[PDB]
Design a protein around this ligand. Structure first.
Ligand code: SFU
Ligand code: SFU
Ligand code: SFU
Ligand code: BR
Lengths: 130, 134, 131
């Protein structure tokens, strides 16, 4: 099976720790998936960050066990003239273990940054065998 | 089944509204797919934009029914010292049973920018289904 | 089948020519992949490049038969104030049963840049039939 969740905005937040991106959540157990592998793609094509010291955003794919994979974008100037849109994609292939019932997207601030999604973003998964 | 289209260049264009990226289309009808879902990825790993006011490019996945998903990159300086390469990927899942006959990659300008692809880019799809519910 | 390989670090290198990113390797032959196609995704979400002339990195997906797709990121300043993280993804679809034995991720320098991965990156592939 294939799974998909998409949003067209998220509340603007800051957080020093990972917080859920609302709506980017896949219920793997509800899909009847209890083993095998899932290729998970977190696609945030048009984010930006605001801040005062090389802003950016750390993104994660998380399961019941916590963060399984992470990454980030950051700007290359201390205070960008304009905080441009920085497409971001993270792929992680995970084993659906007895204890994996969901996958979700999360994010946290780089250097105090406020985190912005104001258009399409998605979390997708395709199941397969090893 | 897997579907793929790829290109290694496109003409430089400026367009206020969405226009096809030449070569990036999947003829779903000809493939003989009339049900289930496609996970579609538009991958433009090395584009750049030129312009006068924080240049950038919007990209979209469209079907015969319209635009399904879109996004953009933009630079962080008004007139960048050099317009660097800004990898872009867009992922959407579409229901072929709704009447879908094709999938296309499209683009349009941010703030009047000219749009540049001069190397590999792709539009890909993997067929599958939602798991049944009881 | 779904093949995948991931890393959380790689040695820093500088190279004019494509070199393998260690650990980003799929052994298609050993998998005994039925004839068909593989959709391959190379995802390097948090790289950076260091250099003094508009730095960047080229990435490629390669099989035993050669490079099948490549691209790059580059910065927009000659000497970036800081070299920020520049997410990169590359997607290509290859044939199985016509001589492909492996798929790998490779990279090479833009303008003499040193190449940096210090966190999660992956190469994955999903099999299917042709149209
Ligand atoms: C509402 Se303009 C939009 O958002 C700004 C924060 C910048 O990222 C700009 O480049 C983009 O076109
Ligand atoms: C012809 Se140099 C090539 O294209 C330019 C437009 C810039 O994106 C540069 O960083 C890249 O290496
Ligand atoms: C250890 Se700071 C980390 O790596 C640096 C090389 C920069 O890319 C910076 O933006 C990022 O937050
Ligand atoms: Br379905």
């Amino acid at each position: 099976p294939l799974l998909s969740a998409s949003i067209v905005s998220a509340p603007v937040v800051t957080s020093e720790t990972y917080v859920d991106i609302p709506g980017l959540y896949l219920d793997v157990a509800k899909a009847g998936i209890r083993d095998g592998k899932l290729q998970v793609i977190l696609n945030v094509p048009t984010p930006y960050a605001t801040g005062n010291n090389f802003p950016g955003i750390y993104f994660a794919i998380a399961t019941n066990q916590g963060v399984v994979a992470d990454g980030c974008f950051t700007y290359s100037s201390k205070v960008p003239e304009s905080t441009g849109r920085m497409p971001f994609t993270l792929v992680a292939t995970i084993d659906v273990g007895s204890g994996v019932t969901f996958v979700k997207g999360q994010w946290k601030s780089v250097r105090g940054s406020a985190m912005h999604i104001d258009s399409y973003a998605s979390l997708s998964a395709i199941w397969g065998t090893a």
